[PDB]
């Protein structure tokens, strides 16, 4: 009997009910998040568990169609997602225990409480408190105390659970005909369709590390300059040739360096581009802040906002007695319903956040016509990068001048331009090496190349040469350093925070090439340009229907993933920083330590 045609009717039946059920779940979640009460909590669970239990029988029926004779690529790819059995491949007890271990990991991470030694009852949490201790403060004792307390009271008590979790989930991944578990994470980055566009996991592992060796000159000079300035700030605390302690990064783990700008500003007298007073002066309330950001997308050529986005969306502060969360989110409830939730304030940071969320909403609206199983980004890192593109293009002094937020006679020049570029330097190119090292360590842990004793005696042993962070105090293996992170207990893919970065600039570069605008890449603008709209719209409308390699063809000719613009966007700063460290030796010797 024919097998190919009879899957089409099953898909047509499945999509209709999936749409409605997903809409009901999303509406329940939105009503809970906007308005919280003891009655609007259990109904959300009643919708969510029904949705979750609905995905186990449609998947069950999607095994009696023998997916080896299906020839059409679209139908085969659509059935590929449904055939994923999920977490029910093992016996019931193993699945229940795995769910329990995940829940207890989350709870233990969310119950962080550590008290000061002098007052055994005065505890601070990750809420405003101990987080602020090592973020905005000038003291070496309290930062060490907080770091050691956090890394010895949370993380040392989570290791025994993670030890069993890793092996259990690795066996689960092997139960789906895969060599490892990390291959499952790499699975989203796999295409096996048209020849010349195919991809493989080994090629990913080889190419994600090859695109890192080109940025070492951009990192060594930044490291040397930061170390020299911090040594000048802190006398007799850092060796002139060694590596720097972890306490002084600015965050708990060193994910971001954005808190170091005020300490290491080169042109202190020269003021930054601040528009808070100008924004306040002429009553820049919540509504027109978003109404202006709409015009930026409308001018390029992207579609105009729907009538109804201004009605349902909860744009402003809820009030006083209507408790709600304030995480900026862009909800896509489906069936033409799009909303945004964000506690707004009149700041330029909220301005950039509004532009980013508008970009997210536009991307979500782009692929609304695809089948239900294909309404996602081409991969993990396409929503976010498209998010930061607009934020990068909206902070330009030219556009701010155009909207009449700066005095027309402004005097942007050398010093302030380098000062601005330094601020964004500390954030973007300060995250790549840590992200790469953590992902490499996680993949090595999952592969099982390392025995039971080489977990905490190799993490720092490679961190010292990939980033240059020294052991403030020696420790035995009983610790567990990476476990004290947000995306390590909730089991979230973490490489999405690396490739995204590169994608941004590649797009920007191509867009700048489709800009005909003369000048350094930092000031390249995309506003007031219809030629820059169609090139992106031919890629936003594909969704997951086409392989992402072909998606990266209507914007950039090269289907590969090469680091071209990271060595271009920071083109002047580097060629200036070569004149900065004219006397300080670059590099770091991994022998000098605080204990030795």
């Amino acid at each position: 009997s024919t097998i190919e045609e009879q899957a089409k009717t099953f898909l047509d039946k499945f999509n209709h009910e999936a749409e409605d059920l997903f809409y009901q779940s999303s509406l329940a979640s939105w009503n809970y998040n906007t308005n919280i009460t003891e009655e609007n909590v259990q109904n959300m669970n009643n919708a969510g568990d029904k949705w979750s239990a609905f995905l186990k029988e449609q998947s069950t029926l999607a095994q009696m169609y023998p997916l080896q004779e299906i020839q059409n690529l679209t139908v085969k790819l659509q059935l590929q997602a449904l055939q994923q059995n999920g977490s029910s491949v093992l016996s019931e007890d193993k699945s229940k225990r795995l769910n329990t271990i995940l829940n207890t990991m989350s709870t233990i991470y969310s119950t962080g409480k550590v008290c000061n030694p002098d007052n055994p009852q005065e505890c601070l949490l990750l809420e405003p408190g101990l987080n602020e201790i090592m973020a905005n403060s000038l003291d070496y004792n309290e930062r060490l105390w907080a770091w050691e307390s956090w890394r010895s009271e949370v993380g040392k008590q989570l290791r025994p659970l993670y030890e069993e979790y890793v092996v259990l989930k690795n066996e689960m991944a092997r139960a789906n005909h895969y060599e490892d578990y990390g291959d499952y994470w790499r699975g989203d980055y796999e295409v096996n369709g048209v020849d010349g566009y195919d991809y493989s996991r080994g090629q990913l592992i080889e190419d994600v590390e090859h695109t890192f060796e080109e940025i070492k000159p951009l990192y060594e000079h930044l490291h040397a300059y930061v170390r020299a300035k911090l040594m000048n700030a802190y006398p007799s605390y850092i060796s002139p040739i060694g590596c720097l302690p972890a306490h002084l990064l600015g965050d708990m783990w060193g994910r971001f360096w954005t808190n170091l700008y005020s300490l290491t500003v080169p042109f202190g007298q020269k003021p930054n581009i601040d528009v808070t007073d100008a924004m306040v002066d002429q009553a820049w309330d919540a509504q027109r802040i978003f109404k202006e950001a709409e015009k930026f997308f409308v001018s390029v050529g992207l579609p105009n906002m729907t009538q109804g986005f201004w009605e349902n969306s909860m744009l402003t502060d809820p009030g006083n007695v209507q408790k709600a969360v304030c995480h900026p989110t862009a909800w896509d409830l489906g069936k033409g319903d799009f909303r945004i939730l964000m506690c707004t304030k009149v700041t330029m940071d909220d301005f950039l956040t509004a532009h980013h969320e508008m970009g997210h909403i536009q991307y979500d609206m782009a692929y609304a016509a695809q089948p239900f199983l294909l309404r996602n980004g081409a991969n993990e890192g396409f929503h976010e990068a498209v998010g930061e593109i607009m934020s990068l293009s909206a902070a330009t002094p030219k556009h701010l001048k155009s909207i009449g937020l700066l005095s027309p006679d402004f005097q942007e020049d050398n010093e302030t331009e380098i000062n601005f570029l330094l601020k964004q330097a500390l954030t973007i190119v300060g995250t790549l090496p840590f992200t790469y090292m953590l992902e490499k360590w996680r993949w090595m842990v999952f592969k099982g190349e390392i025995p039971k004793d080489q977990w905490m005696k190799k993490w720092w042993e490679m961190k010292r040469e990939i980033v240059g962070v020294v052991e403030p105090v020696p420790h035995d293996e009983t610790y567990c350093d990476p476990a004290s992170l947000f995306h390590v207990s909730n089991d979230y893919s973490f490489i999405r925070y690396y490739t995204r970065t590169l994608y941004q600039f590649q797009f920007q570069e191509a867009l700048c090439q489709a800009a005909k605008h003369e000048g350094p890449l930092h000031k390249c603008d995309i506003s007031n340009s219809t030629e820059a709209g169609q090139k992106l719209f031919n890629m936003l409308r594909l969704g997951k229907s086409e392989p992402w390699t072909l998606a990266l063809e209507n914007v950039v000719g090269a289907k590969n993933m090469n680091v071209r613009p990271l060595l271009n966007y920071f083109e002047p700063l580097f060629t200036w920083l070569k004149d900065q460290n004219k006397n300080s030796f670059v590099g770091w010797s991994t022998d000098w330590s605080p204990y030795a």
Partner: protein, 201 residues
């Protein structure tokens, strides 16, 4: 002669409730006087389209009788009602010929036909062994068969249902809110023409 015995357009265009699309509602109107000026000049109609007779000339030449076909459909499927179109409405629920006469009015009804809890009184057909012949309604609800498995009218492995329910709601975006559609078909049999417009003094 002053107008008397006006055709009951008020019942069709202002009814209490419209039926589904797979049992698309039929009405026969003849032997009266029609005034299409109110239909044309009204600003509440989103779509008013046809080709055989221009809207202005509709008051000039007149036909034997009219079939009013009323139903409620989605937002994007309003354009689906046209000769020579393919989909889930022009193929399996309501077929229009390639020589159609008369034409189509469609307007938004989100504030009458929608309910906050989800309106499940509307269904549409999704599967059929053979396409629908022009101007034909089918109201059977036999259990569908997909493969060679003999199903005795019971759900299971590969045996399906022909009707699926809509999910009309007020919070839906445009293009998915319910739109009320009325299609007028004009007949020109050799019997005397009955329905058309007035004279002026």
């Amino acid at each position: 002669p002053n107008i008397t015995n006006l055709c009951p357009f008020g019942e069709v265009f202002n009814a209490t409730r419209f039926a589904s699309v797979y049992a698309w509602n039929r009405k026969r109107i003849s032997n009266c006087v029609a005034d299409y000026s109110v239909l044309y000049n009204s600003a509440s109609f989103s779509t008013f389209k046809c080709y055989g007779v221009s809207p202005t000339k509709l008051n000039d030449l007149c036909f034997t009788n009219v079939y009013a076909d009323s139903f409620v459909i989605r937002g994007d499927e309003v354009r689906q009602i046209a000769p020579g179109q393919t989909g889930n409405i022009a193929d399996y629920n309501y077929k229009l010929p390639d020589d159609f006469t008369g034409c189509v009015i469609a307007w938004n009804s989100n504030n009458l036909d929608s309910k906050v809890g989800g309106n499940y009184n509307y269904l549409y057909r999704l599967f059929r062994k053979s396409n629908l012949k022009p101007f034909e309604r089918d109201i059977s609800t036999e259990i569908y068969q997909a493969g060679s498995t003999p199903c005795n009218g019971v759900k299971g492995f590969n045996c399906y249902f022909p009707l699926q329910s809509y999910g009309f709601q007020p919070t839906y975006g445009v293009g998915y809110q319910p739109y009320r559609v009325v299609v007028l078909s004009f007949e020109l049999l050799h019997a005397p023409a009955t329905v058309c417009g007035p004279k002026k003094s």
